[PDB]
Design a protein around this ligand. Sequence first.
Ligand code: HEM
Ligand code: NA
Ligand code: NA
Ligand code: NA
Ligand code: NA
Length: 182
Amino acid sequence: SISISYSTTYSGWTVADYLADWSAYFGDVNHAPGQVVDGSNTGGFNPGPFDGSQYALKSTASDAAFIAGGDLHYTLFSNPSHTLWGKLDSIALGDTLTGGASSGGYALDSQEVSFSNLGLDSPIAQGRDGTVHKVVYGLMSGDSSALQGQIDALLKAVDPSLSINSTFDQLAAAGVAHATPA
Ligand code: HEM
Ligand code: NA
Ligand code: NA
Ligand code: NA
Ligand code: NA
């Protein structure tokens, strides 16, 4: 089942409100044709260059950042082009990205919320339709809708009274979330 970790700062927020606010603030990095700039809006893989156990990206306008964890593969120019696929186990959101391949991994100096045990897997053949791609490219583009939909389904699978409209504290009481210090 999904497992959520949240800073106590967000105890009274709904998951949906938190994600809407976080993604709007992170913004759209404009990772799109004619606009990709290495070291600005590509993000990076650990160990990389285009595959690994983590993909991480900092916003182009602030130190907000996320880390996707699992067993990830980015096709780049290979068919189907520009597809992130593989196994997505976790998404961590916060600010102040640290580390990288040369450090052995990425971390957030302020990790606000993480969603783990997501159990998502997308085959290469689905291309940019795959859930993994939609979740992560959504975040890159300042749009948490795809992530929200996957979290909502995972919460319903625990109990249909649980949803992204639950607060983090409600989810803790329901056995799927735990608080961390602010
Ligand atoms: C890991 C998550 C990533 C996702 C979900 C993603 C997604 C995409 C998407 C949707 C496009 C647009 C394709 C098109 O419309 O033609 C694209 C283009 C591109 N991506 Fe990514 N990308 C990711 C990572 C990276 C990384 C790590 C690099 C390089 C270090 C990269 C380099 C490029 C380049 C060079 C283009 C084409 C830009 C151009 O045509 O001018 N991407 N990517
Ligand atoms: Na490739
Ligand atoms: Na496939
Ligand atoms: Na269900
Ligand atoms: Na509850």
